[PDB]
Symmetry: D4
Subunit: 183 residues, 8 copies
């Protein structure tokens, strides 16, 4: 069932820093997924992980509280603490970030189709109102609620560059067409 | 008298970073208290320690001078130096911080009752006038002299989140009711 | 189902070094077990992990090849390499160590009952002949095949001391009676 | 052909930090040049390398994307990603930096003749329009397109000081006259 | 009562490595002693601490179990584990080391009088029979039970050199006469 | 002539961080002075060293160029580079800092008498016009040319506190009266 | 010509430690080879590199002098020094190791065919007499001159296991058949 | 008088590890010598320093006490401690090592002439009888008292190789003829 190695798994290990892959592993394994088999989902979780960390890096020192990359029970503990101190409505699904500057939760998505389609997909799910949504694609487009992009252009710009670089490296090894088909 | 371990002691060691617990130990031991017996006071000193360090983190680079977390004789040495260079009145009790931006000493308190009650308690003690007071609770309320909160909202907001997280983790192990009763 | 914390989980985190608990987690999670729920099995895996590492520490520089503490598919890869170079019969179950000095696989067990009973239990399972068995208990007894204890007295002696220390610390927090009942 | 050591090579190793010389080596070797023979070009690549890193240091946190100091195929990958997300025209030659704040590529040159002459030399080559040019000399002069110097005075000032220091140390060992003649 | 600094305290901090003084502090404070006041006892505890660590360094890899330098309740836990696995008689007083090679506890003493006198003093106290005693002096003499010196000459020789060096440095600052009078 | 240790030398080693004392040693030794004999001058050089480093810390990222704490021949090399790129007049004596923001050299002095007296002393020596002077005392007073204090209040305030702390610690060991008499 | 990535290159980066691949790169580049194109030769150089380092690890502390993994001009410098101090005949080709215990140079080879064939190949080339040869294969066989295997069984055994593991991981990604065909 | 740099100084900094050159500097400066002027003596002190450290590395764990590389007053303190504990006669000149295994001081010399001549030179000076002498040359010869070479062949062999390598690198930059003439 689970093999000794795949071309995707080895690219993922040489593409993202060891802290990112360590956390995607514990995250996937927390939800009954094996990165050695679900190789495309493995690349997605690492991409989604790195995006969230560059996003929180763009803000001020104490601007964001990182929800993603935590144990699922720890993540709900921080969400509970944020809601019970700010009074913000408790979301139905685990968000990725909390923005202390704007007092709203953020959901971050990475898509290999039109940002228009994923945003509508993610918007029909949340239904928490106060939860901001920010969608990125592997082509360089972004999409935010109220067109409020939270961060400046330059922080958002480097995220788009990272995504296109990942798209090229995946294609140079003939792994992109399978990746895009997975979503 | 002193045992090999307690449920509170093991939670404190897995909740605060090793630098905080190392300093609460040397602090408690400096005042004839054993963290292995006074387990609730041990959790209080670590909580009070972490709050003071996040507080000084919110300010500018050279904004604060940290008084708490020092040897009691070293702490009075820095207080003497601050008074003898700024001319500020020497406090009767050891404060936690000194604010170079506002030229006042800060006393920081953490309570498991109403911030209204602790503040009045801490205010009747100081009687140093120029010493600012900033009270936090485990429910998310704060209380400052003149309603001058020194730091911005976001720095104060994350402190409240940390406190509520500690309250949850203490309750998940059935240790909160004893902790709240200790104060 | 899975909680925020247990008394066993917090003791395990303050008892074993962070590398051991990190590996027991990835190991348990590899086999569909949550250390946050299976708290006793969590303590067992960390105990069994630390024993195997002190055991390989007793030997010479290049004496042992560590099988335990690897990804289950990586562990079989090393077993395959050892069998295909030494010609040793391939075991039916994953062993813990390989001894280059004696050219045999080692299975290491830790018991909270009589070493006599566990050894007979582990012996009826293996049926690989060339696989050595070495059993330790939390009372200070050991038991090896052919009474060949592989390591000297002093290396085996410190392992017994570590086990009895763990037994005391578990009892000082009233967690031993539940632990012994789990096996 | 290639010797065991030269006076220039030993000065270069004691003048630039080990990360700079490691990267100039991999860079020169990528283009069929031996730093042990092409000793002057070795000093030039290290000087040009250190300038580019102080330049990107002057900007904001996420201001610049460093193109220089990468594998030549990786450098074109980042250039492709920057062009395909910002829409900027793809340069004909590899630039040194990309400025997210001003949305333009930067070419950085270091000269031992008049900044007037090198700039005209570098300008006739690029012909990419949107590529900014910033020229420094070992005498303390600089020269930028549209006289847009991108960075403030103080960041540019320390770069000039570093260059003059390198010029002195090269002269104190009687190696400057050969270096200036190489360009 | 407790001052800001003493000549002995500053010499102790510049004479022993920071790990030794950190442990003497926690040890003295565990027994209601202030190193800032009991300055001579502070130097004694650091000397006695460093001797015990060089002693365990002389043996083999797994030869010794270090009892000194632990929390007093942890130290009794290891003693209990050693007795309950080796069957050795439980000592009445906390020893410094346990020797796995010779299966006996070791008490290590450092004296500023005749090794003859201290040994008789320490021998009348123990009355545990199986507890070995090894006495060192600041003049270069040693004294062991049965004249069994456990370690070779060279390991014992360097310990004597360290002690005489400490005696010289204490005398060069005119602090030795007070130190010798303290014992 | 040169002894094994002095009370001042041991206080200096426990008062300043190891990087400061390492540099004062190489500095004093560069000018034919032994820190083991010239113990007061040793404390002065470490105090003067730490002041210069906190001063450059108060500014912006690339604001200052540190002249003090370099080899005397390296220090003149940087001074030459600064003069030959900014066109500033070359000072007659080695300054401590260069301020890129204000384009002037800074001379920093620490006194145990009136800042009024030392400033007049340092001013009669320089005669370089463009060289700024900033004097601190161990009592909390400061004195700058044109009353241009270069840095804000809070950065200057912490320097005064550090100086008064050093004055107290020197007095608590009865070493201040000799120190003040040395200047 | 040179691409952005290959399946072999990514496996090599996830299989050998970063120090090994860094040195194979500088080695291949020293001889006009690109690891991004010569992917199989890249895997060979890393395999040959790791073997040489485990080999020198098997000996005593000062037993071996490592020739492989050095700059080609530095390697001849050490060879010259070894010959001119021991009087050993200078080899015609660069060897991998020098054995101080047996006073002979060692050439280490790794083959994907019969050790019988490679040894005869390497033996016809050297013609230095005093140069020892030690051949390993990816199947677990070894072959040494005079059947003098220099190291013990256990050190040689782990090298064979490492080689077979590499053979499996290469096959699990369908890269072995191309690798074996390259030699 | 003292310049900004010399060809010898830059070779010395790229030839010996930073700890060696740092100690030769403090050593030379302790005796009124500038490594920036006395460039040949600078290379000699670093060579002599590295030899002494490889020598003590050849022995057992606690075999040697390193006298060289200490402050001159600290070195006499250790010599005093060694004499006053072992009873060995106090040498007239500072030796380099003390051998606990053979209970004798060692003087280590490095020569660029015949080991026969330097040994006779060093022997006429000591006149301490119990002080061993061990002479090395840059050609690969050694010379010890009673032909007692203290260490085995392999430890002494690598020292000779290091010396010949240094001789080659000095010659490749045309610096050897001046170095040999200095002695
Ligand atoms: C401390 C950490 C907090 C964050 C981790 C996150 C990742 C960050 C890593 C840092 C180092 N950098 C910065 C430069 C490059 C790098 O590698 N990265 C990795 C990719 C880019 C980036 O910025 N950040 C951001 C602030 C500092 C930090 O570390 N995380 C991880 C999930 C939960 C969480 O809060 N924690 C807290 C305890 C567990 C843990 O890991
Ligand atoms: C240097 C130190 C000064 C402070 C210690 C305080 C704690 C700080 C630790 C740092 C690391 N960070 C920052 C990221 C996380 C972390 O762990 N923490 C711990 C909890 C959060 C935090 O911000 N800070 C703040 C400035 C830098 C620093 O270290 N303290 C301790 C008491 C006295 C004092 O002045 N000192 C000076 C000498 C002794 C000592 O410990
Ligand atoms: C390198 C490692 C190899 C071993 C890990 C094992 C654990 C060892 C940790 C070391 C550090 N020490 C020694 C002093 C204390 C300590 O903490 N411990 C931890 C408990 C006691 C002990 O001795 N050892 C033994 C040799 C060196 C080493 O590290 N392991 C882990 C499972 C697979 C494996 O081979 N590897 C290889 C790659 C992954 C990894 O982790
Ligand atoms: C992380 C790195 C990114 C940069 C490297 C560049 C060099 C920087 C080094 C840092 C450390 N500092 C800062 C203080 C002194 C120092 O030494 N220096 C060296 C000279 C001065 C300077 O500021 N910077 C700048 C941001 C942080 C960093 O490291 N580079 C190198 C080429 C490609 C690239 O992006 N990376 C990314 C992966 C490979 C690598 O090396
Ligand atoms: C790991 C530690 C175990 C020992 C500490 C003891 C001290 C040792 C320090 C080491 C580093 N070295 C060796 C070179 C110099 C140095 O500094 N020193 C200090 C003086 C000389 C020496 O050899 N040793 C010996 C084995 C390795 C080690 O660290 N200790 C301390 C008291 C309890 C205990 O078991 N532990 C375990 C957990 C807490 C802790 O501190
Ligand atoms: C890099 C260094 C540049 C500076 C050294 C100076 C001292 C600084 C040390 C840093 C670490 N911090 C900051 C937190 C505490 C600490 O310890 N300190 C020591 C006292 C307080 C302080 O801020 N600074 C300032 C910028 C970063 C740095 O390191 N110096 C030393 C003399 C010449 C010089 O330019 N260099 C360059 C090469 C040689 C060297 O040492
Ligand atoms: C110091 C080094 C000397 C050797 C490098 C070689 C590699 C060794 C790395 C060490 C760390 N370990 C040991 C545990 C795992 C590890 O990673 N490895 C890597 C694979 C296994 C191994 O044992 N060894 C062996 C002795 C110590 C050391 O480092 N080399 C490299 C080529 C030239 C040379 O002499 N040097 C000297 C200067 C340049 C350099 O790199
Ligand atoms: C600890 C030190 C003791 C010794 C220093 C000496 C040098 C040793 C450095 C070590 C690291 N290694 C070993 C691998 C390479 C390396 O770099 N080297 C440098 C060249 C080769 C070598 O083996 N050694 C030997 C034992 C460990 C150690 O460090 N010294 C220095 C002079 C006085 C003294 O006793 N001390 C004690 C306090 C001051 C100090 O520096
Ligand atoms: O919340 C998310 N994951 C919670 C924890 C987790 C992590 C990894 N695997 C399973 C669960 C989360 N997931 C995704 C990925 C990519 C596309 C859809 N997809 C998904 O698993 O749902 N995209 C997000 O934007 C996001 O927020
Ligand atoms: O100053 C304080 N402690 C000085 C040093 C010290 C540290 C630990 N134990 C004893 C003494 C200090 N203490 C406390 C704690 C929590 C509630 C009351 N309580 C207390 O011990 O008084 N709350 C503060 O706000 C505070 O400022
Ligand atoms: O792009 C550049 N190099 C790409 C990679 C590279 C690095 C080193 N060697 C060869 C190729 C690049 N080179 C230079 C140097 C200095 C003067 C002219 N010169 C040159 O090699 O052309 N000056 C730049 O300003 C620059 O941008
Ligand atoms: O420039 C200075 N030293 C250059 C290098 C140096 C360092 C140490 N010792 C000798 C030379 C320098 N010195 C001092 C000290 C303190 C009081 C007077 N004094 C002095 O040595 O003149 N005060 C400064 O303000 C200053 O700028
Ligand atoms: O000496 C050797 N390389 C010197 C430096 C070097 C390194 C990498 N590429 C080119 C040159 C060396 N090479 C090899 C490899 C594997 C099979 C044949 N092959 C080869 O390149 O010849 N096998 C050895 O056993 C060996 O000793
Ligand atoms: Mn998420
Ligand atoms: Mn998301
Ligand atoms: Mn307080
Ligand atoms: Mn407080
Ligand atoms: Mn197992
Ligand atoms: Mn097992
Ligand atoms: Mn370029
Ligand atoms: Mn350029
Ligand atoms: Mn004791
Ligand atoms: Mn004792
Ligand atoms: Mn100065
Ligand atoms: Mn000054
Ligand atoms: Mn080779
Ligand atoms: Mn080879
Ligand atoms: Mn000497
Ligand atoms: Mn000598």
């Amino acid at each position: 069932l689970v093999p000794r190695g795949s071309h995707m798994e080895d690219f993922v290990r040489q593409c993202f820093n060891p802290m990112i892959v360590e956390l995607a592993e514990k995250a996937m394994k927390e939800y009954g997924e094996d990165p050695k088999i679900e190789t495309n989902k493995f690349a997605a979780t690492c991409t989604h992980l790195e995006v969230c960390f560059m996003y929180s890096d763009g803000g001020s020192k104490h601007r964001f509280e990182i929800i993603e990359g935590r144990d699922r029970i720890m993540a709900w503990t921080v969400v509970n603490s944020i809601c019970n101190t700010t009074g913000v409505e408790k979301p139905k699904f685990l968000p990725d970030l909390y923005d202390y500057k704007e007092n709203r939760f953020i959901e971050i998505g990475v898509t290999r189709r039109e940002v228009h389609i994923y945003y509508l997909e993610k918007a029909n799910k949340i239904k928490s109102e106060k939860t901001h949504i920010h969608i990125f694609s592997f082509t360089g487009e972004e999409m935010a609620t109220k067109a409020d992009y939270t961060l400046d252009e330059e922080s958002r710009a480097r995220i788009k560059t990272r995504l296109f670089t990942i798209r090229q490296e995946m294609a140079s090894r003939s792994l992109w067409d399978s990746f895009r088909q997975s979503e």
